[PDB]
Amino acid sequence: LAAKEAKLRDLEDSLARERDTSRRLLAEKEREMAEMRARMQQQLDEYQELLDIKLALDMEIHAYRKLLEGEEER
Amino acid sequence: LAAKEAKLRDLEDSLARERDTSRRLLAEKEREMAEMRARMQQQLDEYQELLDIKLALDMEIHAYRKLLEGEEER
Secondary structure, three states: OOOHHHHHHHHHHHHHHHHHHHHHHHHHHHHHHHHHHHHHHHHHHHHHHHHHHHHHHHHHHHHHHHHHHHHHOO | OOOHHHHHHHHHHHHHHHHHHHHHHHHHHHHHHHHHHHHHHHHHHHHHHHHHHHHHHHHHHHHHHHHHHHHHOO
């Protein structure tokens, strides 16, 4: 037990340290991923909102076209 | 060294195992995050593409308005 009960101490220190480092790092990654997933959802919602505006404009242009067709028809 | 050179073996086994588990898990998280960042970029690009279409439609509607104003003006 000359260095055996001494090296076991240095093992448990660095095992505790690795555990701490990897769990804190993982914690950061999950926070960052959840922030990413939230931004992505908001972005899909804003796209859908723009698309609805776009499709309504397409319909207005159809209507103006029809009025113009009546005007110019020979 | 009765159990001291024996428990040091069980320490290095589980330290090697923790290292392996956390590094493979981290690897997955980074792959997943990079996939997320790629989708987010594509999504911002598609939004910008829709917005440009939208703004062109706004201009066409302005133009049709002007034509209609000339038609109806008293």
